[PDB]
């Protein structure tokens, strides 16, 4: 299989430095190159630099030339991008991409590395099950919730029934307030499914190595 695989999410302090990696596997011999891209807020993309003999060697966008350093382990085809003088504006998803020469195009992209630049403290989330209001069910369908409150930094992942319950799931983007994120998820199933069958929300917060399961239980008096 031909692919680019980037290293995992980061939290780094203002004024420190970070080094992310991108491993290429399965590519034909004698075609190594790598390009690096930044995308803030899931929106605009900009190019940092590249290593590509067919495009003139190692080169940087003037904007990033001071802070960025691109290297490569040629034996393992692993690219590295080191960034220093980190500021909050460097908080972004960083992509690697590899040019495929025939015409040419950027045929392969890494999955992206999320980097958060902040002095705020890592904080594991509280995870709360949300059962419907106390009382008899009114309707043929029921909606349950999971609340993931007060964590830092991103990301978190959430599933229902370890991923086997996927349709009817709405997981909402996290919202940041006072250096803490809050996220929620709703799931909707037929009344004859719950509480007859077990429904659990599973939450992982990688920064704190947290993995938590909260079963949704009918409320009491």
């Amino acid at each position: 299989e031909i692919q680019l695989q980037q290293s995992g999410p980061e939290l780094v302090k203002p004024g420190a430095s970070v080094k992310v990696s991108c491993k290429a596997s399965g590519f034909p011999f004698s075609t190594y190159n790598i390009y690096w891209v930044i995308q803030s807020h899931g929106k605009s993309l900009e190019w940092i630099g590249y290593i590509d003999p067919y495009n003139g060697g190692t080169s940087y966008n003037q904007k990033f030339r001071g802070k960025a350093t691109l290297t490569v382990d040629k034996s393992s085809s692993t690219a590295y991008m080191h960034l220093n003088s980190l500021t909050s504006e460097d908080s972004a998803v960083y992509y690697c991409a590899r040019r495929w020469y025939t015409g040419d195009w950027f045929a392969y992209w890494g999955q992206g590395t999320l980097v958060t630049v902040s002095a705020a403290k890592t904080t594991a989330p509280s995870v709360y099950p949300l059962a419907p209001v106390c009382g008899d069910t009114t309707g043929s369908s029921v909606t349950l919730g999971c609340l993931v409150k007060g964590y830092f930094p991103e990301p978190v992942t959430l599933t229902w029934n370890s991923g086997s319950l996927s349709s009817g799931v709405h997981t909402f983007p996290a919202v940041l307030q006072s250096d803490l994120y809050t996220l929620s998820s709703s799931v909707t199933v037929t009344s004859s499914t719950w509480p007859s069958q077990s429904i659990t929300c599973n939450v992982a917060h990688p920064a704190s190595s947290t993995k938590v399961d909260k079963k949704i239980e009918p409320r009491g008096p």
Binding site: G42, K43, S44, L45, E46, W47, Y50, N55, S59, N61, Q62, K63, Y95, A97, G103, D104, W105, F106, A107, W109, G110, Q111, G112, S126, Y128, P129, L130, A131, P132, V133, C134, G135, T143, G145, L147, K149, H170, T171, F172, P173, A174, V175, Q177, T182, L183, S184, S186, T188, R219, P221
Partner: protein
Amino acid sequence: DIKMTQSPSSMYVSLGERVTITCKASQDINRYLSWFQQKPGKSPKTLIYRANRMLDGVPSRFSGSGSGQDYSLTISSLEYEDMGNYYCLQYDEFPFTFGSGTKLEIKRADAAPTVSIFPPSSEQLTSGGASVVCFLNNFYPKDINVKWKIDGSERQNGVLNSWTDQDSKDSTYSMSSTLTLTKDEYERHNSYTCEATHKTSTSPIVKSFNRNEC
């Protein structure tokens, strides 16, 4: 630097309709223009390279055209899976330049939200906080307002709202609204209400509960 101007920034389009996105470079870029699609949480994917060259694995309804400074991407017949963001790219000279992007959203019939309200969990109460959560699921269009009321009185402080992207399976939107109170402020009041104002109803859709009723 070579600058790029992409339009429109967003657009609503029906299934089966002809979609055109345009891109203007600040100089002749000799057709070194590529088009990309990007879905939420995913990496960009090339649709077209050298302005009009097509790729295996990209459906034939995508095509590109132009030369000099002016380029366009065409979707001859929109399909559900085409929902997402689109970017042009000049690669005549490095540093390469992406356009600012086009958000493509799909038209559907109007739909009223399904509203559900959730009292604080016993776990959070034992920890000393009290969040009240309201889900507004599967509505259209995107424009919606949520109001919280406590004992009949509107509350604006302590509210966090979050919207999903356009639903990839029914083209609706959903939003979550969380009203966070202290446990003792929660215990000083009886009725908690979230109401949704939307195009689909002249009157708000109201979900409420009482802190002790069952």
